[PDB]
Amino acid sequence: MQIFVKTLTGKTITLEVEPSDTIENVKAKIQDKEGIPPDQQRLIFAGKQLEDGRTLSDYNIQKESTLHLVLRLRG
Amino acid sequence: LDWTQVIAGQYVSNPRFNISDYFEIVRQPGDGNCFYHSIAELTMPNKTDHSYHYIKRLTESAARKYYQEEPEARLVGLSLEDYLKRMLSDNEWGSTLEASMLAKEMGITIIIWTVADEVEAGIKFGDGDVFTAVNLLHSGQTHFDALRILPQF
């Protein structure tokens, strides 16, 4: 199915995923399309930061849902 | 300026600009305590190269209070105690996680502007605005300096 990820930038990407995909799977998909290391990624939905181990379905995240991608910035 | 609250007390925004157009940049050492030097710069009078030690202490008490519930501490995956031992080491990098905890601990707003030589985004900890906030510059993906709003604003 399809969901959208809005990057820090505000860039809006599409992702092909299953409800059974883990938040971790999703982060590796994001790394594949946009080149962002997963350990830098915070995916947020409905005011909650989403846990790597859980699935899109564990989160009741349906088709064409939009996630926010906030980065961890170190220096 | 358009801020969206993605999680409680955390806001994101997407303006594009050169940093030199709105801010003076006050460069900070490369030692790499820069995140702490940058906060000292903007919050501590008589700030010198040793002032950061005190922000590291406010960071240590902030963590004792907020670390275990910070969303971003889940990407760190250290116990509160291991985090502390690492964070208090000399040269240890600060980040958006310390900005979130210091915002609460110091009752301030901190904004980190990251630059992809221009500005790609900002992340804001706390409810205040660019004028009353502590403004940090994140550059090269690996470095912080302080910013001061230019005189005419």
DSSP state of B12: E
Can you tell me the distance from the alpha carbon of B118 to that of A50, in angstroms, rounded to the nearest whole number?
Answer: 30
Look up residue B149 and give its two tokens. 């709003």
Annotation says B53 is catalytic: no
Instruction: Quote the crossing angle between the two packed helices B52-66 and B34-43, to the nearest 10°.
Output: 100
Q: How many residues are there in chain B?
A: 153
Residue with tokens 């105690």: B81
CB contact under 8 A, A49 and B71: yes
DSSP state of A46: T
Can you tell me the distance from the alpha carbon of A9 to that of B115, in angstroms, rounded to the nearest whole number?
Answer: 10
The per-residue DSSP string of B63-95 comes to HHHHGGG-TTHHHH---HHHHHHHHTSTT---B
Nearest to B72 among A8, A72, A75 (CB): A72
Q: Does domain A1-75 have CATH number 3.10.20.90?
A: yes
Are B47 and B85 within 8 A, CB to CB? no
Quote the minimal CA–CA distance from A21 to chain B in Å: 19
Residue A29 identity (one-letter amino acid) = K
Residues 6+ apart with CB under 8 A from A17: A1, A2, A3, A25, A26, A29, A56
Are A71 and B113 within 8 A, CB to CB? no
Can you tell me the distance from the alpha carbon of B120 to that of B18, in angstroms, rounded to the nearest whole number?
Answer: 10
Domain ranges in chain A are 1-75
Pairing, β B119-125 against β B10-13: antiparallel
Are B108 and B128 within 8 A, CB to CB? yes
Nearest to A29, CA basis, from A60, A66, A10, A3: A3
Q: How many residues are there in chain A?
A: 75
How many CB pairs below 8 A link A and B? 68
Residue B88 half-sphere exposure toward CB, CA atoms < 13 A: 14
Annotation says B21 is catalytic: no
Question: In this structure, which long-range contacts are made by residues B59-62, counting pairs with CB atoms below 8 Å and at least 24 apart in sequence?
Answer: B59/B87, B59/B94, B59/B98, B59/B101, B59/B102, B59/B105, B60/B84, B60/B87, B60/B88, B61/B105, B62/B98, B62/B101, B62/B102, B62/B104, B62/B105, B62/B106
Partnered with residue A4 across adjacent β-strands are A14, A66
Can you tell me the distance from the alpha carbon of A44 to that of A66, in angstroms, rounded to the nearest whole number?
Answer: 9
Cα A25 off chain centre by: 9
Q: Does A73 touch chain B (CB under 8 A)?
A: yes
Sheet containing A12-16: give its strands across: A12-16, A2-6, A66-71, A41-45, A48-49
For residue B6, give the 3-state DSSP assignment: strand
Are B51 and B58 within 8 A, CB to CB? no
For residue A4, give the 3-state DSSP assignment: strand
Quote the minimal CA–CA distance from A44 to chain B in Å: 7
The full set of domains in chain B, from first to last, is: 1-153 (3.90.70.80)
